Amino acid sequence: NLVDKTVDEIINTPEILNSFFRFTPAFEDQKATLVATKQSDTSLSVSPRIQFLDGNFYDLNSTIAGVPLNIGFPSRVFAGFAALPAWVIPVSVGSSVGIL
Amino acid sequence: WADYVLPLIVTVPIVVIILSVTLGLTIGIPMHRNKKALQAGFDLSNKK
Amino acid sequence: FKPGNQIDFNRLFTLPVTELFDPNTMFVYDQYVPLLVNLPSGFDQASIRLKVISYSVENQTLGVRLEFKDPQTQQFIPVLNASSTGPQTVFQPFNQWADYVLPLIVTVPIVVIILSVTLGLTIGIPMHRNKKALQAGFDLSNKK
């Protein structure tokens, strides 16, 4: 039932968006998170931020000595999100007035 | 169950509207025809 | 802190302000912090929270001050740049509504029922009289 939330709430709720992937570490206690990016009013994209052997996190924008690494992490799209229920009172009044 | 309260608020008025419009048309259409038949009948009575 | 044009008041104030904070210590619960304060990407959300400083439930309004971990010290500090009123702000519902949707589900069908019954009686009562008048008229025509 996440579809009834705005993309902005989903984007500011990193525990929700850790539930968008399952991660298998190559070495014990290697960690990973998804960075979210708004794509439309109804969709987002996510890309992993993953620790290497040196304890540091790398993602699409990582550099060494200022040179982009361009490692090749994926971007995955999630879509279908709607606006939150601010409309309920005006709408059920409209329906009643219409019926009347 | 119980997820459905917000769509029930959408769905109930729509069904009522559809049922009301149908009821209106079902009563309304013959009432116009009855009137015309009555008039025609009286007109014919007067002619006879 | 979020400016007043960025607040969706029904999301904050459909529940009373009475339980946004722990009564034992008057800090606001974590779920309301990102709803009231803007923070950068990758930020540690456990490092900042809001303290209640005055309120009134009959006006549904809450007044708060923010405290953040000092990067240099094992202690919390205020964030003085957080608003035009400094580290302190107030929030309010802008309009006076409540749980009125719950009786609306009782009231709407009742009015519809009353209006439907009245409509039925208003149409139904004359239709019976018309029938009788029509019959009487024909009966009289036949007699004449």
Tell me whether residue B32 is exposed, middle or buried, using C-beta atoms within 10 angstroms of its C-beta: 0 to 12, 13 to 18, 19 or more.
exposed
8 Å CB contact between C109 and A92: no
Q: What residues of chain A have any CB closer than 8 angstroms to a CB in chain C?
A: 12, 35, 84, 86, 88-89, 92, 95-96, 99-100
Residue C28 DSSP label: B
Residue A36 DSSP label: E
C142 contacts chain B (CB < 8 A): no
CA A73 distance to own-chain centroid: 15
Residue A96 three-state SS: helix
First to last CA, chain C: 91
Kindly report the backbone phi and psi dihedral angles of residue C22, in degrees, each rounded to the nearest multiple of 5, phi listed first.
-75, 115
Helix H, strand E, coil C: the string for C45-80 is: HHHEEEEEEEEEHHHCEEEEEEEEECCCCCCEEECC
C-alpha pair distances (Å), A48 with each of A55, C136, C143:
15, 87, 96
Tell me whether residue A66 is exposed, middle or buried, using C-beta atoms within 10 angstroms of its C-beta: 0 to 12, 13 to 18, 19 or more.
exposed
Q: How many CB atoms lie within 10 A of CB C52?
A: 17
C-alpha pair distances (Å), A28 with each of A20, A32, A33, A63, A93:
21, 12, 16, 25, 58
Amino acid at C60: Q
Handedness of CA A17, A21, A26, A29 (dihedral sign): positive
8 Å CB contact between C80 and C87: yes
H or E stretch covering C88: strand C88-91
Which chains pack against A, by 3+ Cβ pairs within 8 A? B, C
Residue C33 neighbours by CB under 8 Å, 6+ apart:
C45, C48, C49, C50
Binary contact (A86, C11; C-beta < 8 A): yes
Residues of B in contact with C105 (CB under 8 A): 9
Binary contact (B16, C112; C-beta < 8 A): yes
Task: Give the one of A84, A92, A100 whose C-beta lies nearest to C104's C-beta.
Answer: A92
Residue whose C-alpha is closest to residue A2's, from A32, A33, A37, A42: A42
Strands, DSSP E only, in chain B? none
Residue whose C-alpha is closest to residue C53's, from C38, C71, C66, C70: C66
Residue whose C-alpha is closest to residue A82's, from A25, A27, A41: A41
The resolution of the experimental structure, rounded to one decimal in Å, is: 11.0
Residues of A in contact with B6 (CB under 8 A): 85, 88
Residues C10 and C26: their CA atoms lie apart, in Å, by 23
8 Å CB contact between A33 and A20: no
Kindly report the backbone phi and psi dihedral angles of residue C93, in degrees, each rounded to the nearest multiple of 5, phi listed first.
-80, -10
Method: cryo-EM
C-alpha pair distances (Å), A45 with each of A11, A42, C41:
10, 11, 15
Residues C89 and C60: their CA atoms lie apart, in Å, by 15
